Amino acid sequence: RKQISVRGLAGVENVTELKKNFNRHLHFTLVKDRNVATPRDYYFALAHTVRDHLVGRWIRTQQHYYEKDPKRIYYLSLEFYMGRTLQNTMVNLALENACDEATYQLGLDMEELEEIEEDAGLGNGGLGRLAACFLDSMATLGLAAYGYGIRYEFGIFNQKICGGWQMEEADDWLRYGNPWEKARPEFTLPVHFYGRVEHTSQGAKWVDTQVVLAMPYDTPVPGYRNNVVNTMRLWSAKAPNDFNLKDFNVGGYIQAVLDRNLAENISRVLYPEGKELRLKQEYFVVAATLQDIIRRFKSSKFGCRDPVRTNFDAFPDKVAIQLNDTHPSLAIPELMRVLVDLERLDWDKAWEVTVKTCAYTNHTVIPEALERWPVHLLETLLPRHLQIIYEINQRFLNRVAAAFPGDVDRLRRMSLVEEGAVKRINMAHLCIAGSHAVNGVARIHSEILKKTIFKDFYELEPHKFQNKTNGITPRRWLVLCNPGLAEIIAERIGEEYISDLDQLRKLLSYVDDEAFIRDVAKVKQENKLKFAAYLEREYKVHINPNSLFDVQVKRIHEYKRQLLNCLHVITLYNRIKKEPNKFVVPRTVMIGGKAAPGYHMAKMIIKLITAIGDVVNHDPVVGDRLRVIFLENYRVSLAEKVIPAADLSEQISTAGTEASGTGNMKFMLNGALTIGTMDGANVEMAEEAGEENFFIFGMRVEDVDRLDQRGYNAQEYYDRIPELRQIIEQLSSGFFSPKQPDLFKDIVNMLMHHDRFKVFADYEEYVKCQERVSALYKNPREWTRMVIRNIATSGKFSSDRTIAQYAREIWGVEPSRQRLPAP
Amino acid sequence: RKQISVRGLAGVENVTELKKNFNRHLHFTLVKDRNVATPRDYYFALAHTVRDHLVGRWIRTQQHYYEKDPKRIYYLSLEFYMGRTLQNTMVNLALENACDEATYQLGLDMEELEEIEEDAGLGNGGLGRLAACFLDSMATLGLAAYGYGIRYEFGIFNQKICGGWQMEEADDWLRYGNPWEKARPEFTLPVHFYGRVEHTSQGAKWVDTQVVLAMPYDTPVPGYRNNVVNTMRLWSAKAPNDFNLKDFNVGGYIQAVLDRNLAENISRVLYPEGKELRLKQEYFVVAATLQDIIRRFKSSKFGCRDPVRTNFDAFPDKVAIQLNDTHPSLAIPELMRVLVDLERLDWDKAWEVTVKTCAYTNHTVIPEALERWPVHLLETLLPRHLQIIYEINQRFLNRVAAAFPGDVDRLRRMSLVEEGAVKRINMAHLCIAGSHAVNGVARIHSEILKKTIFKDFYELEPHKFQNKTNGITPRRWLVLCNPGLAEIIAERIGEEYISDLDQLRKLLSYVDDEAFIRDVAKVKQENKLKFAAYLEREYKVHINPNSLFDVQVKRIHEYKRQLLNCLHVITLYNRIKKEPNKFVVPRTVMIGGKAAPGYHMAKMIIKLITAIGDVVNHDPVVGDRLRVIFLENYRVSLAEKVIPAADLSEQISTAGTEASGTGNMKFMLNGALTIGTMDGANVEMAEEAGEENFFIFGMRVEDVDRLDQRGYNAQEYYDRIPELRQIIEQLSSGFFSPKQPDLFKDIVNMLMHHDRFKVFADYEEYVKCQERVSALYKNPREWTRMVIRNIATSGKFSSDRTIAQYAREIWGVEPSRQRLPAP
């Protein structure tokens, strides 16, 4: 028994033991030989060779927490956007050098292999990426932490552009296996749906529930070189498969083959209204996670440390659930169902525990975005969960009246239940009620969570409102993707910045020196070259390495403002064609994102951006002064290529719409200069980088409210501005669409007659901020001089910080930059 | 490249490298650790320490085959009754001794761990088990063989007796994975169903077909210590999952959620009439194996060796295809299909090759049993294949006309098209026409196919019919299951017997040496002691390890006669209790079988065996002079546990019912006497042992044919024989059934008025033979000596013999027992 140990199984940094274990997984785990392997095989071979390294540590880390019994914190979220784990496993595990040398000797080129990896499809955007980043920084900072979510077979769509039209292909990233997960069919848990609550004697009973099974899969997450590796644990839905003869539902009728498939596809697709699948999904990931969380609390030596009921008294001293957005919110009536009905704690011992154990991050600014479910949808598949939502609610509103006696209209403003046609439940006031702390994601955004959106709750409990600004991981977003920039920096300062990012300000001391200043425009020359080849070898065009790489890689929504940017490039195209000879600083403009299937404005816009380009890029006069490029199927491993080769990071969202900008922080730290409105992220970045150092522009928040107060009359601008007048005119003539002139008709009328977001307002200012830009590119010494200052200044934008604060003010744990002994 | 070699990965019989490998797998593979591990988890680590050694050999053996280009033989069966891979994989590879040592130091019990493996639910009966025996033999004699079937996810049922009634439970054997297979997605092939045949220009084209996908799984098969490890490749059906958006069938309607369930379950269950499911499991394994077969032909250096068509002229000289019974029959219109339509050989060239490629093994006797598919089934799911079956049928019938000019009643009896209500196609006559050798499975059985069942095919082509008697492997069925018996036998004659079983004749030399005579009984005393301990510790009864373990482990049907051996147990009762103190040599009768859901007689026969024992085994007079046990859920792992432990092997079918009897042969080898009729396998086993050493009995066939010629009037026997009368009258009075007396009334009436298999007829002679049995037992020197002349005469029943004759007389290759150098 004790002879079964982790002890002899590694010669880690060793190009010869790593050549031994690559061979071991290709013939014995893959059961192939060099006579028939494929790149895919040899990548699988290599993913198990860096993985036994990771799971060597994993067992130690984990053992360590069970004998050291920290508070354990569960980050719950419905999207985890990991993307390729090979390079990140190696660079955080130290192993990249040994692996390169080893695969080299074995006559295999490790880069060609890292490009066989499928981006882990469990994310779709920001929110996903964000949790992805907090998992890194959590483990780097040694927290007893876990990420808990659904595993999505089909990701979410894979974008194809055919005809200058977006077609979504399916992403089955798992089609050939995933080398990093470990399934767990022994920890399968039941998840109950529908049914009836029979109230019997000392509780309520929820009976006749259908059931779907939650089957786990553990992917590990490695710290930065400290040998702590923690668990991400995604659930998968598996139907009961009695459905044959067993139960005697069937025999007579297998039409229940629909139980079978509707179940299995809880886990099949990410979402992408009030759907019984979304709510089915949300309940899924909460109900399994909470049985697991409770099980380590009964196990994790607290089986011994009972003193009370294996108490729930200690439950808040031992566990922390972070709800990410409102999709986790039933974590609160579900912990209240498990605690009350299953265990037996009275409602108030139970609710003490719940509030003290949860917390809720918010990411929305418009109230037309806070989740809301139909009470008839929660009565049908969740009936106990609606009674508890009602009893939480009663009790919360009795607290409210004992604070503001006689306010009546507040009792109807703060409720969980909302009345209209279709009485609904408000998922966010459920969360503020059942959390001990709420935090925004931007200072601007949590002030407006306090001041307007949740202000009566901010009066009733001011002390719940905190703020915790979002961040990026230094690792992925500078060391993995940007290694020259991480080399030259390091030369001049040290390593420690990658685990204490603000140290970057020491590079301020180098602002004039002509070393950094050429190096930086060197690396930056590197990056743009490589990628200016990727733009020919996988996808194709004729870039110009020299140019302004002008990129907005933003979700394609109206309010994100691609169309502002398409007028501007139609502006440049015009000038150069009237003035076939002006020295105009050239640009290669690169817009990238995925629409949303069935959002036809977004499908019309990616139509715009191709059609412009086919005009410009095939017109002689423009030659190679002006190229427009649509980056198909923008995603995390295209992020890490593009964001290093960029100069101009285009942040133009209407002001007030953005709650932040994580994608934003990522172009600061890789010396891209940020054009953009004074919103969300752009604010704290300008604060650090110095306003002078940032191309801030257009309508502030204020000015928009004012233009709304007097009413936005689009046409006026169209009639001052002679360029605009003409570009609208070229759009409606069919300049840019000769086969269907009429093609951009809707777009026209979008802008002219009912633009919700004031593109034509911010035009005139935009094209003059852009004039400042072209003008400063062509002064490389100073252009590059600013960049050094933006980079230097990036350290509040590191996720390690963001975590340190959830850690210190919300969770109650001191981080630790220590190295866990191990391997 | 070349440095990626199988070479440095194994210190084999090294208790220090096996423990190192256990530990890599518990931690690295399973991502478990000794705080969390379970006995299931440790068996998977042992499972894997061993598999590295297996697959090692498999890599060197398949390479070997591609560099020497042997004739590859493919065994086509829908049933492979493997049972348990681990004790068997260690013995073939010599590792049993080192793993015991190794796990013992780690302080884990290798017998504990072995008992957690699930019996590979890939079969059901003697057809499956033969195919497996053949597989161990084809590898032990250096045959370049491959076995091909379907992977059934649920097996066929698991048995469970509840109040003595059979309840079938499911067999999700695949539930915590199976660690011996390797799923190969990369090699998925489509299989086509339904459709319509477009007849265009140079060919017909099968168009508009539904497509199910066949994914392969490989399980390696080890020879006995000769280091050749061969392939079993079982197929899994998967639906194409575009079903969501892609095709534009879906969207508007997903009621084609059924294609998906009705595709998915070709691979779901084994069977268990004219069902589309069956013919769709039949074509599927055929469709998907003939492509992988024509792929190795085109690939395995015969690309090089084109000279003409990659001529399929050489196709017989390099492929051979064994259709085990009629379920692979479609391999004859599908090989012809591929070659005529896909390639473009003319009909006659293609038929030369199909006939020289295929060979049929038949296992039936009654003609009611020969497979038959209605032409409306074939016309619908297989409309090209119906066509080909018609040309084949026309043309064979024109051969027939030239041979028997003007014999018309022959033209109609030799047809593959059958005329009656429902026009059927006769899949047996298909097989004799496109195969180049038909064969029986025991000499009497070969002979009735030639004189009665296929005799006009015997007449037009006498060169085709062979015989190749069944055979059991000495490894599983003696070395593996009864190692004691192998050991005393080894002391005297060495090991060569295990790979050369005729050599057990040497044991005759020692019939009269008294060490052996006592070692043999000793051996057996152990086996029964062991077993008796199971019968209290996994199931419960009170054995008395001293009595005569009397056993029947046959399929529960009416011709298999357990009601005969029911009657006989009640006679022995009736006698111990009429005369409570006379001496009766005591027995523990054990009868086990699995009913077959839907057969009501079978189902009451086990209710019978289970209640006889309720009475006899609690009736205090009987003391321990009888006991009766229904063995729960007979499968290969209970066979290697009961078959060692027994004395008399109950082989009682009515004469003329049995073609052969794999069961039987395992009993002779493990020193058990065989009481039973002169049918099937009993014939040649009697002939090598001599009559004198067997307890043959009852109506011989020529007699059953007489009693039918005059008409078996049951009543007469019930009115001569008094003890018969007595038991019938016990059955109807409710002796055994006191709460519903009337319960065995349909058994009683069967017996009385319509037994097709003449129980009463053999009853009188039967119980007489049991008296000669008890008699001799009660004389341990001479009972042990008759036991030693059964074991010594075992030789003809070695599946290495049956294989060598297939190879030489049908497949056209030579056994070699040569060690491939390897590892």
Ligand SMILES: O=c1[nH]cnc2c1ncn2[C@@H]1O[C@H](COP(=O)(O)O)[C@@H](O)[C@H]1O
């Ligand atoms: O009681 C324990 N003591 C030490 N290590 C443990 C114990 N329970 C679990 N582990 C380790 O913790 C990991 C995670 O366990 P889990 O929290 O139950 O998922 C396992 O892989 C083991 O390495």
Ligand SMILES: O=c1[nH]cnc2c1ncn2[C@@H]1O[C@H](COP(=O)(O)O)[C@@H](O)[C@H]1O
């Ligand atoms: O052309 C070849 N040369 C050498 N080994 C081969 C070749 N093709 C296949 N193999 C080996 O044969 C194994 C089985 O391939 P299969 O028989 O094609 O299914 C592969 O896994 C390799 O070990």
Ligand SMILES: *Cc1c(COP(=O)(O)OP(=O)(O)O)cnc(C)c1O
């Ligand atoms: C960082 C990131 C993001 C985040 O994108 P942004 O914060 O810039 O804005 P939204 O698109 O509006 O959220 C999204 N996707 C990936 C791949 C990524 O790396």
Ligand SMILES: *Cc1c(COP(=O)(O)OP(=O)(O)O)cnc(C)c1O
């Ligand atoms: C050998 C065997 C069999 C086969 O049983 P029998 O050969 O006795 O004859 P039938 O009953 O007629 O098929 C079945 N099951 C197991 C486990 C086994 O080992």
